[model samples]
Target chain A: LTDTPVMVQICISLAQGVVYWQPPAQALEKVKEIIWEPSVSRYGADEGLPELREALMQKLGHENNLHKSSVMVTAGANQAFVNVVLTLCDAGDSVVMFAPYYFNAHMSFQMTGVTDILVGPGDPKTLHPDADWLESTLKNTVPTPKLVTVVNPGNPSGTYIPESLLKRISDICKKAGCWLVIDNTYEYFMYDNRKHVCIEANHIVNIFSFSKAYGMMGWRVGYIAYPSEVEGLAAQLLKVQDNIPICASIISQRLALYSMEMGPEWVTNQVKDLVKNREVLLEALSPLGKGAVKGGEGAIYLWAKLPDKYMDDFKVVHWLGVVLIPGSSSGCPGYVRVSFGGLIEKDCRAAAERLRK
Target chain B: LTDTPVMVQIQELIRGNCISLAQGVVYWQPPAQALEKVKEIIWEPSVSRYGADEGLPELREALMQKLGHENNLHKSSVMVTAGANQAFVNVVLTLCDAGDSVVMFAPYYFNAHMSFQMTGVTDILVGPGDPKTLHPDADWLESTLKNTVPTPKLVTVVNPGNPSGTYIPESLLKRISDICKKAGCWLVIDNTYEYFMYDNRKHVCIEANHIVNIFSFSKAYGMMGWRVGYIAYPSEVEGLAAQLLKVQDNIPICASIISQRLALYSMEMGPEWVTNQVKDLVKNREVLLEALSPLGKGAVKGGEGAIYLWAKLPDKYMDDFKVVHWLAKRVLIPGSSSGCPGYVRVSFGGLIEKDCRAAAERL
Candidate 1:
């Protein structure tokens, strides 16, 4: 069904404002019940569906032990991240993110008028977030930084920050009266038997996604557990939400609700496939030299540096038939990111053979 | 949703409340065929991929033609968004930078006001003389434009106004549009209720430079849950589409492809369906009027336009925010929510005959 001619024609007609057509159909039968419901167009709540929020509260409590007064469903985790920045910072206000940060977060800050981003350092060797460097950076920054962003099992780096390091960063943020925003989109994908750490404290915002863990990336549903302890944060977020997406796509919200009801086992079962992809991808990148891959400990990506001769990251991207992201895009030069979460074990194996050449 | 006295009272609704007129939704579902069409393709790989950053191209082109034919808005480019709310925010972000002032009239739509405030804009043209009536006085606006310390970035209006429910007259909109243009600021019009015209009124489409037309299918097609809307701007407004897209790319990426696809079907089954829905809404407005007459003469106004019925509270209940919280029989959005006090915006579009009668009884 990947862009077949007839379906592509259907897509074209659908684009043309043609309302009626018969598409060969068969979605999971469970999904049909909600899709066919008449009230599906009502757009139930400002925050999200009541059942979904309660379900997520329970999920956050039991699975991650992360608690907050409330949660707001976002178009995706990105909206939640953007909302936190919009809520915390005014124009010219700054934020602190580790170098090699999530590029989307950087883009969001710039979009929201937070031009002054103070880039703190990351450990070049291990790719672990340097809390010591972050503390100093946050302390010395002018007109105190509004937020300190951490992407857990991180984006480009894929390095997992232990609870202790996270706690150190949290306390540092509290001292500076800044908010600690953590993106835990890859919480369930940790390797080496490592556990994801979540904290509920003053001035901390936690972001989670159904896309990575539950395989509904196209549904565009994610949520934030804002610091309940932060005075009036939820109220401010409601204003933001009312104007933003005005609630994510209602159908997507329902999908998220039902997916949570299906429980963590479905997510765990899927992670098994990623586990295989990770191993094959790690072995495939062995040519990049010892410690060449810095963080494949969690998330779908492995951060690997190219050899010195291929000094420019973009030029070396086409050397292997398999595709890789230029590390420079994610704030690291001379490196590339190989992602496996979206790939199959067979695809990874296929890539390994080509890369080992 | 803003933690207002009335908004907070809504939690009690979950405690077994029903018959809400609080949200601005419609009582009817969109064309059944559109729903069936979307359901048929739910499993298609089409629903799972990231679509165009602006919107599906087919939807935009179709929308372009619709604006050309119906609204008579030609030579404009269209961009789809999560909703008109997102489109409004996109306009604010694209047109206003730091310290840029936006002049919104009194009794503004709360979401529009919130979007402007989100960007730290806090200017209002106190009263364009005789704001007491349904439409703005362009003569007053012409003078007000000169009074701005510096030219404001944008002048905003909601035709078939959301809270006020006043469909500004066409000549009046032209006068204001020309006034805005002469002042070197854009005229941003939200036509979300373009199809909700009652009392036999025609929808107005201003054809001019620097005018932005925001359209939504939420009420037009009764698909508020779909979260899809589009912005149509003059092609001469160079780089505007790309600028709006930049803010859009960072925020939502694009509206839901499923909803966007659903909107295409809804659009194919066009404005007539909404005009048909408007008939019943007009009936709903009558039911509301009969219920509210006991309050006073001229107690209810602006039902000739929007799905909303703007009603002044009786003297006893004049404190709308606090009183509506305790007025548990029905739900009403406080006048304060829309930047006016001592009145409530009663939405009749989302109600049916039985619920309307029931709410009347409760009133």
Candidate 2:
């Protein structure tokens, strides 16, 4: 689903006054000490700084239990997405994607010259491509799809994939020999008492971004973890990765380390606020009735279908005078996404009131 | 011909606090404030941010001026390298079109793997392959020329080629140029030592690459810990370089802008200090000549060109207990490289004459 520009504008405003939790003053002070001049020694490789690599390893170790060798740091998950696309699929290779996809995920496939074979997650009223449809689509392709992306705590719907369904997808991808790429950018922002399961441990290559959850958007650091067999290809692709971002910005990395080491309880406390905000949103949008989202057990957003009486998603969004995520951008229409993650319960309730009226 | 093992040893020792150089801190620090988060609306392009596109206007603007982009920032001969290695990788990727030959006069730098392995370029070594036998066998390659690979893409000579102290002799370089120019090859000279030219030798890369020379700062700036370097490319190769580096990762544009800014200050403030230090190096080398000259500078072919006075081991020494070997254990700076044995590089630069005198006596 698309991020709301109006919300982005608000974020831009809030950002001006927002002091990040930690100063990262020591990291900045150290970064200032560098000097650039010509080297008299031989050329070295472009794998990036070993310290950044070590920090990435430490983060992955704490977050996902992935070993150091399995993770490759990237500029962001968006970049990791594009690099994965470039490395795995060639031009014209079909990428099978779940419905209500991340907008950039689809765009990344476009950027990589890959064809998108979209498989819609059946309608909310009646899930369209059910188990039968999924089996047939996976079984019937002329040339098997090489990539299938599933966003856990789905982007627009905020629907968490059940463990049983997760197993089914793993089997399907195993049969298809496709890389099951899970975008887990919002895993930490999951609401309610639900746990977000990373597909990385299930033999799926997962992309983890530190932007939203870690408040590291400007820092631009993310990573991908895969199995041992993928190491050689990953090493080659990492050269391309380094060529794009020499290394994740040292400033961002230092901040991320601070978050991991010192801000654990602070992040846990944020989840409680997020859960309360999500419930407040559900109650405020209740007048829209059945059209309001149903099962958003996890994730920060709830994809509320614009009532049939409304003209369209855009019109509903405009009339409300409240910015909401665009479900249409993710191939789901008549729906608007509201990310409670960004607002407090009071702000979310206020926005919902504007939308309901 | 090889890196003076002492530099690595000394750096390690300094880090561990064996010999202090003025300040107890050996030389390592974190990032700066100008680069840290500034509260403002940063309206950058999506491609520029996420795709890591090259030459952000501010970075490119400053880099061009630093790399001789002329008065106009747009006219400079700069290509942003990820690290100096990635810059070399891009050069290799652009020049070697698979199975193409790249000629290098050894003893070469250790990090040549970026160019060689990634592009699948075959290294065509010139002269008597052994660095100690730096003298060219004039007739040896004439018969071999019939089988030599044609239309090679990169003709590389590390000015003061790493392990060998050879600057391509004018006549030799001219002949190499004839072979390369006829084949439409790039005359790539890694003039990393363009500023550190010892004993008044002309680097001569001006006639090479149409006067484009590649230099890195890790060695010269005492900035190895900083991880930055730049390449000054030939005018023709500039655009391609932008595309190559711009696509995947834009090397830290302007290379830690604060680092670049400080460079402007250091080059100005530290000039006299640098000049005096360079003078100190010349004095340090004199003591080595007294102990090492008997082995002879002219004894080896290109030994005269490299800064290190090359000394072949005496017959009494075995593989492990060579004089260079004994020096390394005693903390005498010039010592052996990994593969190059029976010979070691003496580092006359970056050391005080008092230390050099003791090191020479110990050797």
Against the native chain B, each candidate's TM-score is: 0.91, 0.66
Model 1 segments more than 4 A misplaced:
A1-28, A275-292, A306-324, A345-357, B1-20, B129-132, B207-209, B295-299, B313-318, B322-330, B355-363
Strongest candidate by DockQ: 1
Q: Highest lDDT among the candidates is held by which one?
A: 1
Per-residue lDDT tens digits for candidate 2, residues A1-357, read 011111111011100101122223443344233311122111222333355566656766676566634666665676677656655665456777777766667755653335455564654652222445566777887677777787776666667776567667777777767777777776665555667665453347777766666554544567777664643555555544533344554434444454455444556566666666666778767877765675456656676777665636666655554566656767777777766665444454354354535
Q: For residue B256, give model 2's deviation from the true position in Å.
A: 4.7
- Candidate 1's displacement at residue A25, Å, is 13
lDDT per model, in order?
0.73, 0.49
Question: What TM-score, computed on C-alpha atoms, does each candidate reach?
Answer: 0.87, 0.58
Q: Candidate 2 residues B1-363, lDDT tens each? A: 011111111111111212211111112112222222221112222211221234334444455665542212233366534346545654554455434555554345544533353333434454344344563332333323434666445656666555455565556656655665555566666655444446666545444343334555444444443334556665554344433443223223224332333333334333243333444455555665565655555443333443444455544442523453344444322223312445555544444555454444433
In candidate 2, how many Å is residue A58 off? 5.9
Model 1 has an lDDT value of 0.73
Q: Kindly report the fnat of each predicted structure, to 2 decimals.
A: 0.43, 0.01
